[PDB]
Amino acid sequence: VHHVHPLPDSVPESEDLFAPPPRMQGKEGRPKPHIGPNYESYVKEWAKTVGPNSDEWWAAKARETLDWYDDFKTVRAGGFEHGDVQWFPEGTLNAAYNCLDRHYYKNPKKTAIIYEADEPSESREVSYEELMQETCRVANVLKSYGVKKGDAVSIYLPMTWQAAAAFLACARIGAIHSAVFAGFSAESLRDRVNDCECKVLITTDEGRRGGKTIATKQIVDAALQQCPLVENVLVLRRTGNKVPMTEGRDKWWDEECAKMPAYCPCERMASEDPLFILYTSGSTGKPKGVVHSTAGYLLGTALTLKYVFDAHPDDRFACMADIGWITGHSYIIYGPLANGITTAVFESTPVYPTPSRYWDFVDKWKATQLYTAPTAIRLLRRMGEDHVKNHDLSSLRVLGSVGEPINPEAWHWYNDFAGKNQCAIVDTYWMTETGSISIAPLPGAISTKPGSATFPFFGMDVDIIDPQTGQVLEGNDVEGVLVARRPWPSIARTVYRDHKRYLETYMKPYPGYFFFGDGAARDYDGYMWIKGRVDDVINVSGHRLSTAEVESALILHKGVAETAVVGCADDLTGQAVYAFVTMKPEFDLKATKEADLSKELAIQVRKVIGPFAAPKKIYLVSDLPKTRSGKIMRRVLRKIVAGEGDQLGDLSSIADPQIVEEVKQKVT
Numbered sequence: 001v002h003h004v005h006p007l008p009d010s011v012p013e014s015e016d017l018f019a020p021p022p023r024m025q026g027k028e029g030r031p032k033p034h035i036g037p038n039y040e041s042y043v044k045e046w047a048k049t050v051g052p053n054s055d056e057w058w059a060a061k062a063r064e065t066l067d068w069y070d071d072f073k074t075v076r077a078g079g080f081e082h083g084d085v086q087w088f089p090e091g092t093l094n095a096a097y098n099c100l101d102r103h104y105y106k107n108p109k110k111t112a113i114i115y116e117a118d119e120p121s122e123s124r125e126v127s128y129e130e131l132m133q134e135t136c137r138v139a140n141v142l143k144s145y146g147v148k149k150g151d152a153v154s155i156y157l158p159m160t161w162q163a164a165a166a167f168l169a170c171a172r173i174g175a176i177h178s179a180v181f182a183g184f185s186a187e188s189l190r191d192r193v194n195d196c197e198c199k200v201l202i203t204t205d206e207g208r209r210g211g212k213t214i215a216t217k218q219i220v221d222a223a224l225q226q227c228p229l230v231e232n233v234l235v236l237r238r239t240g241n242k243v244p245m246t247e248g249r250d251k252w253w254d255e256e257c258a259k260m261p262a263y264c265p266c267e268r269m270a271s272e273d274p275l276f277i278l279y280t281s282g283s284t285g286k287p288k289g290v291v292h293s294t295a296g297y298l299l300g301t302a303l304t305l306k307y308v309f310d311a312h313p314d315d316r317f318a319c320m321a322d323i324g325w326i327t328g329h330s331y332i333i334y335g336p337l338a339n340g341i342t343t344a345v346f347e348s349t350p351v352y353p354t355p356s357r358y359w360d361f362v363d364k365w366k367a368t369q370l371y372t373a374p375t376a377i378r379l380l381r382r383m384g385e386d387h388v389k390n391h392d393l394s395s396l397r398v399l400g401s402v403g404e405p406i407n408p409e410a411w412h413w414y415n416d417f418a419g420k421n422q423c424a425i426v427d428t429y430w431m432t433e434t435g436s437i438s439i440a441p442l443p444g445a446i447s448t449k450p451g452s453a454t455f456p457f458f459g460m461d462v463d464i465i466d467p468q469t470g471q472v473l474e475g476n477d478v479e480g481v482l483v484a485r486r487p488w489p490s491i492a493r494t495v496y497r498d499h500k501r502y503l504e505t506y507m508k509p510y511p512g513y514f515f516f517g518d519g520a521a522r523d524y525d526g527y528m529w530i531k532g533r534v535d536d537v538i539n540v541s542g543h544r545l546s547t548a549e550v551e552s553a554l555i556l557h558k559g560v561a562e563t564a565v566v567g568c569a570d571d572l573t574g575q576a577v578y579a580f581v582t583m584k585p586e587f588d589l590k591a592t593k594e595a596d597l598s599k600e601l602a603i604q605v606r607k608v609i610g611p612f613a614a615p616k617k618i619y620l621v622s623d624l625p626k627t628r629s630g631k632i633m634r635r636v637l638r639k640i641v642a643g644e645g646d647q648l649g650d651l652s653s654i655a656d657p658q659i660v661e662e663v664k665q666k667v668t
């Protein structure tokens with residue numbers, strides 16, 4: 001008699017609620033959680049962070065968490081309507097000072113970064129001392145190129161530890177870094193370099209990932225042929241293979257830094273000075289450069305890292321994402337270093353050299369938290385439990401999932417094998433535009449449901465709106481689109497040189513609120529469930545189906561590895577469901593009739609969800625197009641089903657781009 005249902009799971013609901021396990025109870029010598037031990041302890045604190053009396057908590061947290069050069073007077077001002085959001089406006093600080101210097105002063109030899117190289121043997125620890133020195137050298141290099149406060153600097157770097165040095169060097173001097181995924185095409189890089197109008201670019205000669213070479217300098221040379229503003233390129237010698245270097249314009253990182261001293265003063269930045277531009281990916285049109293301020297962004301990432309992952313001073317936090325993704329900005333670099341702990345820079349893939357890489361990593365470094373995307377989790381689940389069963393992994397207390405809904409089936413695999421049923425699983429919902437985690441369980445306090453984001457984070461006041469009426473749906477057991485009622489410190493302040501695009505996209509669809517673009521439901525118990533992108537909804541004869549529920553139903557079938565469902569025009573039902581399925585490699589599609597597997601999947605969807613949810617067609621494919629932003633390229637599959645595959649655009653964001661040519665063949 002519940003209008004909203006959990007994402008489909010094999011475990012009955014009665015047996016599917018997971019209270020904080022002993023490692024998250026302060027037992028067995030593990031640290032005490034910062035918030036606990038139950039749901040009410042979370043509400044008691046959160047209620048201090050929203051509403052008309054929350055200034056006090058926020059003022060105290062900002063003064064406790066960050067080192068300031070000048071105190072602020074006003075806590076907050078502004079709003080969504082014109083996009084004039086302000087937090088701590090009169091304060092001054094520097095992000096590099098808070099992520100490096102202050103920690104270097106207390107414990108210089110403490111490990112700031114665990115650099116997990118593409119080849120495991122080349123891995124090493126980078127202390128705060130070394131990281132600060134390299135950051136200062138690069139900052140000195142940038143100042144000699146004439147970079148001033150407020151100038152954009154493009155960064156095209158792979159996942160080597162110096163990427164952190166380059167982010168922080170820009171922040172140290174007040175420049176605005178703009179990081180682009182290594183491996184993006186020359187065209188994509190060009191569009192971002194030209195939009196941010198930078199005069200300096202930082203890159204490598206080459207990157208190494210999964211044993212394959214990323215030809216970064218060659219791609220940069222092709223892009224710069226159409227980037228007339230770029231005058232200096234700083235090239236890090238990562239592999240040492242011969243690459244072209246333009247005399248005058250191109251200089252070697254090691255040769256330039258050797259000329260510079262190893263300390264550099266910090267630019268004193270206003271709270272609202274821009275910290276960075278981060279261009280989103282996966283759209284056809286103009287790239288969208290999301291801008292973040294300094295003090296609110298930093299405080300938000302520091303508080304989320306502390307509270308969502310229950311970080312403590314000696315923790316070794318392992319976020320395995322790429323720094324070209326907001327997840328890397330916030331939970332590799334800014335969040336963890338702000339808190340003064342050890343953070344991971346993972347250069348490889350989850351299956352190089354074998355699908356045991358993640359767990360070999362955890363046991364070698366004694367990682368205490370692990371944070372990756374559902375795409376990685378489904379991949380590891382796909383390769384079998386042999387690569388996980390005989391690892392220790394007991395250093396871990398918290399496992400995190402970010403970037404897409406995590407199917408209960410994958411949630412359980414994570415819970416059973418990575419955590420051995422002794423970690424808390426935090427499903428973190430947020431966006432590039434929100435700066436930091438928006439909805440997630442606090443692991444010492446919240447009992448989890450597989451596939452639920454649970455409850456909003458401090459400072460976040462979220463609601464559900466009927467998109468048909470535009471009115472808020474009060475109470476529980478409601479479904480609609482997710483909106484936030486009030487600004488929060490780490491919200492993006494604008495889209496670079498395109499504020500109108502910022503207002504029209506996020507602020508005007510539901511005037512007075514911030515519009516995430518996701519469908520959501522709040523269940524009988526008040527847990528939030530992120531259903532998927534509003535754009536991915538399929539309307540079958542008046543029934544609106546979300547992607548997370550159908551993909552979750554499909555993966556409950558034995559042998560299914562990963563799925564993706566997209567809609568297309570249908571005369572009978574308005575829109576029809578088309579499902580793309582990949583199976584485990586041990587599956588014998590010769591012994592099983594493919595017509596029979598498609599029929600068994602259609603029944604499984606009809607049982608779990610409804611009579612209307614069955615797919616009209618099902619395509620069996622070896623893999624799906626995925627990005628390093630934790631997402632499946634559904635728009636691409638939708639266009640291919642629509643016959644518009646001839647003009648799909650740039651697939652540079654997809655991990656293995658050759659897969660789209662296979663999907664085209666099988667759909668035709």
Ligand SMILES: CC(=O)NS(=O)(=O)OC[C@H]1O[C@@H](n2cnc3c(N)ncnc32)[C@H](O)[C@@H]1O
Pocket residue numbers: 326327401402403404405406427428429430431432433453516517518530532533629630
């Ligand atoms: C962090 C990130 O991904 N920033 S992002 O800008 O790259 O994407 C944001 C979009 O990603 C989807 N998304 C991200 N996390 C989850 C999650 N935990 N559960 C369900 N959906 C999720 C959602 O659609 C967002 O709107």
